[PDB]
Every structure is written in structure tokens, then in C-alpha cells.
Paper text:
Mitochondrial Hsp60 (mtHsp60) plays a crucial role in maintaining the proper folding of proteins in the mitochondria. mtHsp60 self-assembles into a ring-shaped heptamer, which can further form a double-ring tetradecamer in the presence of ATP and mtHsp10. The crystal structure of mtHsp60 reveals three domains: apical, intermediate, and equatorial domains. The equatorial domain connects the subunits in the heptameric ring and facilitates interactions between the two rings of tetradecamers. Our results showed that the E. coioides mtHsp60 (EcHsp60) forms dimers that are incapable of hydrolyzing ATP but can reassemble into heptamers, thus restoring ATPase activity.
To understand the molecular basis of the inactivation of dimeric EcHsp60, the crystal structure of the naïve EcHsp602 was solved at a resolution of 2.35 Å. The dimeric structure of the naïve EcHsp60 (EcHsp602) revealed a twofold symmetrical conformation, with two protomers facing each other in an asymmetric unit. The N-terminal (MIS and residues 1–87) and the C-terminal (residues 508–552) regions of both protomers were not observed in the density maps because of their disordered structure, and only a partial equatorial domain was built in this model. The equatorial domain of the naïve EcHsp602 showed greater flexibility compared with the apical domain, as indicated by a higher average b-factor. The α4 helix of each subunit protruded out from its equatorial domain to interact with the adjacent subunit, with the interface mainly composed of van der Waals forces and hydrophobic interactions. Two intermolecular polar contacts were identified on the α4 helix of each subunit, involving residues T89, E100, D103, R444, and D494. The RLK motif (R264-K266) located at the α9 terminus formed four hydrogen bonds with residues from another protomer, including E212, R264, L265, and K266. The T89 forms hydrogen bonds with D494, occupying the space of the ATP-binding pocket, and the D85, G86, and T87 are disordered, leading to the inability of EcHsp602 to hydrolyze ATP. In contrast, neither the naïve nor the mature EcHsp602 showed any ATP hydrolysis activity at any ATP concentration. The oligomeric conformation of the R264AK266A mutant was confirmed by negative-stain TEM, which showed that it formed a heptameric ring structure similar to the WT naïve EcHsp607. These results suggest that the RLK motif is crucial for stabilizing the dimeric form of EcHsp60.
Numbering used by the authors:
A (entry chain B): 114 to 479, 514 to 533
B (entry chain A): 115 to 479, 513 to 533
The structure:
């Protein structure tokens, strides 16, 4: 391990010699104060995107003036909402189609990247899958194998949603997926506290499944039967998101669940609890906008589907945090805000000066004319670079 | 835009911190010092040649485990200090040693999506087919008939070619990911005529045929089952490929070895003697298989990791020797830094960085429990810092 100690010294003593004994913690503090100040200024320059027109304008310039892509995006955002669920699919027709189907999305991705089965976009895509819902963590082999056996003997992919999947249970899932191509994926349950348990129950109703380990039934995972699984017509899991389309739950059961949420909505004075109940109610009642891209051939629609997805993600990022001048002009215009920064040391000065000098570089390398970048993209680009 | 920002922060960050120093001249001083240090390392190194010295190194790298040191030294007694040694799980209580036929070359899988074993990021197959090609593989229709033959015989397929790219690689990746197609692609080793010779050597060892060669010119589409090579066991990492128990007959292997020893006789080039001797060791010399036993699968997996670590440290020690004293040995290289002739103030800085870091490993003083340091591990760590 002499090699490991020697490498950490060259890195450590390399800073002290080059910087003439500067404090790295205070330099990092200078970078963080400058970055926070630039981002705060970025929120000032940003212009919101909420109106249907200015959404279409942003969506049009997001697709390089395709108009057809811009209008099919704004039309989807009209029928499903500014923050509604929109997904892109391959249409078998000549023109672009828009359809609203049953489904929902939540912000948790696959627990392991080995569950990837689609290199394009690094996603896990299944059709007609089983859904295993667990209110407790799944850590042991004994608690996950019976569910794998039933799914595998039915030749149905298996989506597992639990508080967490770790330990030997996760190792077993990765082993079978990698070694013998078992169609399986595991994701963490969204939310916290009772809201997490309620969201799990909502999935069971929407997909016709059962939640294991809940306080009510106390169903053991080793006693799983086939009908305990939920059913999903289509699954699409990325490293950040999970999309469940066309659940197997009957519309009557969905409606009774919406009635309980409506009852709780009139039984609380808390604004936060109402916010969570309304998010759950919308996930159950609202659908998913599906953009079916059409064209002349199967090779052309695949190329057009990508340009639609890229314009879709950029438009979604604009309705979130707004838009700023593109070409690096926004970062160049946040530089004078750094002169107001009150630091303590000369090392904090160095950190600010590093940001002050680097903000000109992206612009030096390069609204009504389409020269626009979304605020979210330019802000996260600065946080990750720093 | 995020990479430009990240590079701009690193570039302008070094300037602001170093008060306007030349990064090239500093790096030149770092590499100049590392060069002289490595010279003193090799002069000070002690070789590992004797069976007792090999076992001593393996025992210390096994935390004093004499049994692990014994089985590593025994494996080297049978296949030589530079022979191929692999580690496997054993079905008995103790460790076994088995000499089998096989070969290993320094080319890994073309895409990490071919991994089917998370532990060590490996692709492992048993009783597999081997497709060999002197030309690049790019089209799907060229490999589609080879795939159906492998699917009909229910055999994994290893593809060793000049390269596998284009739509052929993408559909191989897509089929592996989506439907669990057991396939892996590896670049052919060597260059020029030597690469053609090693490919033909692989065909003889496995009983297959090289497609697209200059002698026959067999097309990939005219493939028949007997054109495949047969391998008993395949282990492919990101850097290496191990083919065990090839299906070639002993007679054709003896003939191929007779051609190499004939060319070995009529050559004076030490580099060509090395190239032909490397080919002869692959075709003739055997592979040592260490089967690690235990009373439980947890103990076997744990012991297999310690045997692998001790083996890697022993192989590194056999190649370049061991460092006597470990950290204290780097102290004898510091006086050699005082003779380096620097040019500009930034070059003296780079030398001073190394002079500071070398003093540390001894200043801190595993070492009390007895550890050795292979000269290769220390040398590569110094080069990786410059």
C-alpha cells in the first residue's frame, strides 16, 4: 500500500508547493460563494415560460424551428398540463399522433445500472410486466426468490418497487439478470413517511396488485401468489425516472381510491398535506401524453423520434426554471455580480477569481432570434463543473 | 457547455492558484524527478526467483497465510514464474491445483455491456463457440448466420476479429441486453503479420477456421458448424481473454508448434525470438487452475479474493522484484534528485513536489505486520502521478 500512500502525497504536497501553502478549504469556499452568487443572478435574468404561446415559441426554437415538432409538443403540454407526463413512441403512421393513456411516472430510477436492457438512453424497457410492491426493505435471498420463480415461470418481466433493495437480495437480482438474462428491475419507492406508504398503495390499486409488509395486512413476501403482483402494460425506467403505462387495476377500484383521497383533502388544514394529496389524486386521475411520431419509413421515424425527445426535454427544462440568453451570454452577464462578494481571506479571493475568469470562456469560445438556453441547463452545468 | 466550463475552471484555476506558473514546465520537472527515482528503484530492487522467495512473497500478500503462499508457489513450479494462473471456486474443503490446456491474450471485450458477471466485471462462458475473422465485422447479415448456428446448438459465441463495430456490434449489444443473447466480441491481438499468425494459432488450438484470411478467403456467410472453434471455458475481462480447453486435436497443435520452432531456429532478432516464443507458449504451455475450497460458499468466495490478491502481488513481484524496506527505500532516492539540472523556476517546483512526497511513507512509519512492495507497483504509481 506504499503506492497508495505515495499517490496521496504527490496530490497533497503538489498543492502546497504550487499554491505556496494556500488553504484549499478557503479556496473551495471562494468558489462556492461565487457560484451561488452567479446562480442567484441567473434567476434574475431568467424569463418564465408558462403561457401556451411562449411554450410553443420555446418548443419551436428547441427543435430548430421544426414547427411540426414544436406544435406537437405544445399540444401535448396543453392536453396534459405544463408539468404533465409526456412520452415519445414510434408511430406506425405517416403523421404525428397524440393519445392520452392511463399511466403515471415517479422520480426514482433503477437501483443498479446492470438492470439496463436498452443501450440507447441507458434505460430498462419492458412490456406486460409483473409489479412487486413492498413497504419494507428487501435484503435477503429468501424474501425475493419466490417472487422471481413465479415471474420467471410465467415468462413475465418483473418490476420491484420497495423501500430499498440491497444486500444479497440485490446481488441475486443482478446475478440472474446478467448470467441468464432474467427480465427484472428494482427501483426505490418514492416519497417519505406515510406519503411513501400511500403512494405505494396507489400503485397497487392502479396496477391491481398488493403491497407486502404493510401494517394492515402484513403479507409476507415468501407467501407471494401470482395474483399479488400488479400488472403494467409498459415499463420505462431510466437512472432517474420510472414510467408505468396501462396498469391492470380496474377503473372502479381506481375511482374508490380517488374517493378516499378526496375525503382526506377535506379533512386537513395543512397546506403541505394538501399538496401531497393533490399530487396523488392527479397521478391517479390524469393520464400520460404519448407522442406517436409518424413518417415515411421506420428508419426516418427513429431519427425524428430522437429530435422530438431532445426538443421535449429542453422544453420541459424551460417551463421549470425559465430561459436565459444563449451562447454563454448569461454567464458573461453574471460576472459583475461577483464584485459584491464579501470574503474573509485572500484564499477566498482566489476561489472567486477562478470563477470570475472561467465565466467568460464558454462565451468567448462561441431572444427573438432564437439565441436562448434554458436556465436549468446552464445552472446545473455550473454546479457540476464546480 | 458543461465540459467547457469544467475545463475553464481547471485551466484558470491553476493560473490563479500558481500565480502564473507554466503547467508544462512543472510537469517536466515532475517527470524528470520520477525518471531518476525509478532508476534508483530498479538499482535497489531485489528479484524474486527462488521457490522459497516466491512463497514468502505470496504468504505476506496473504496476511501470513502459509497455505495460500504454498499453493501459489506450487502453481508456479508447474507452469513457470510467468505462466498463466487462474483462480476458481472449488467443490472440496481444500485448495486444488490443476494444469489444463489454454491460452491468454491482452485483449478484453469491445463493449462493457457484454459483462455477465458483476464480480470483477467479467464475461464468463462454458462450452462456447469461437468465431475467428481476419477482417473487420460491421454488417449484421455477415454474422446473422453464425448466430443462428450458435443458437441452434445452444452455445455461447465468442467473436475474435480485427474489430467489431457498426451495426454488427450494436445488434450484438442490443440482443445481449434485451433477450440475453450469450455473445461477446474481442479485438484480435497483435498487429500486422503477427496478428494474422496469432489468429491462426487460435484456430488450430480450438479446431476452427479463420474467416477472411488471405489463403482461403472464406466468407462469414458460408459458415458451417465445423468452422467454429470450440472452447471449454471462456473468461473475458476488460483487459484480458482466457480461453481454456480448446477443441483442436493434439496432432494439428503439434504441427503448428513445429512450424514456430522451425522459424525460431532461423532468426537472430531478439524481438522476433520473443514474438515466436510467446506464440509457442500459448499453443504448448498449460494453464494452472487454482480451485479454492472451503466449508461454505461465503468462505470460498472470501478465500478466492485473498488468493487472487496474493497472486497478483506475486506476479508483479516476479516481474520487476521487490522493494526492500518499502517506504524507507524511497528515502535513498531523494539524494538522486539533487543532481537533476532544472531550467526555469517552474521546473524546480516540479522536482520539489516529488522530493516532498518521497519523504512521507517513512515519516508515517501493515508495515508492522510485515508487508513487501513490488517494484512494479511502486514504479507504475509514480508514473501515474506524472
Amino acid at each position: 500500500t506504499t503506492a497508495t500512500v505515495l499517490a496521496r502525497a504527490i496530490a497533497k504536497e503538489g498543492f502546497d508547493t504550487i499554491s505556496k501553502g494556500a488553504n484549499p478549504v478557503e479556496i473551495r469556499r471562494g468558489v462556492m460563494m461565487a457560484v451561488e452568487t452567479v446562480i442567484k443572478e441567473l434567476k434574475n435574468l431568467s424569463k418564465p415560460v408558462t403561457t401556451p404561446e411562449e411554450i410553443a415559441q420555446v418548443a419551436t426554437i428547441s427543435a430548430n424551428g421544426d414547427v411540426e415538432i414544436g406544435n406537437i409538443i405544445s399540444n401535448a403540454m396543453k392536453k396534459v398540463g405544463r408539468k404533465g407526463v409526456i412520452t415519445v413512441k414510434d408511430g406506425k403512421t405517416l403523421h404525428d399522433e397524440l393519445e392520452i393513456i392511463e399511466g403515471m411516472k415517479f422520480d426514482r430510477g433503477y437501483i443498479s445500472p446492470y438492470f439496463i436492457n436498452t443501450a440507447k438512453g441507458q434505460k430498462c424497457e419492458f412490456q406486460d410486466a409483473y409489479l412487486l410492491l413492498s413497504e419494507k426493505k428487501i435484503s435477503s435471498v429468501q424474501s425475493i426468490v419466490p417472487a422471481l420463480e413465479i415471474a420467471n415461470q410465467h415468462r413475465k418481466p418483473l418490476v420491484i418497487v420497495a423501500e430499498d433493495v440491497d444486500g444479497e437480495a440485490l446481488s441475486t437480482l443482478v446475478l440472474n439478470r446478467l448470467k441468464v438474462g432474467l427480465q427484472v428491475v428494482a427501483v426505490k419507492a418514492p416519497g417519505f413517511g406515510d406519503n411513501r406508504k400511500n403512494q405505494l398503495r396507489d400503485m397497487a390499486v392502479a396496477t391491481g396488485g398488493t403491497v407486502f409488509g404493510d401494517e394492515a395486512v402484513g403479507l409476507a413476501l415468501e407467501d407471494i401468489q401470482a395474483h399479488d403482483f400488479g400488472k403494467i402494460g409498459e415499463v420505462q425506467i431510466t437512472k432517474d425516472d420510472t414510467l408505468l403505462l396501462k396498469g391492470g387495476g380496474s377503473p372502479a377500484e381506481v375511482e374508490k381510491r380517488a374517493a378516499e383521497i378526496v375525503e382526506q383533502l377535506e379533512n386537513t388544514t395543512s397546506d403541505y398535506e394538501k399538496e401531497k394529496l393533490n399530487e396523488r389524486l392527479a397521478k391517479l386521475s390524469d393520464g400520460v401524453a404519448v407522442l406517436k411520431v409518424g413518417g415515411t419509413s421506420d428508419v426516418e421515424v427513429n431519427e425524428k423520434k430522437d429530435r422530438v425527445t431532445d426538443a421535449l426535454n429542453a422544453t420541459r427544462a424551460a417551463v421549470e426554471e425559465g430561459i436565459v440568453p444563449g451562447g454563454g451570454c448569461a454567464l458573461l452577464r453574471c460576472i459583475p455580480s461577483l464584485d459584491a462578494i464579501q470574503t474573509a481571506n485572500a484564499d477566498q479571493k482566489i476561489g472567486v477569481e477562478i470563477i470570475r475568469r472561467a465565466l467568460r470562456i464558454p462565451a468567448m469560445t462561441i431572444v427573438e432570434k432564437g439565441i436562448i438556453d434554458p436556465t436549468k441547463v446552464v445552472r446545473t452545468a455550473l454546479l457540476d463543473a464546480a
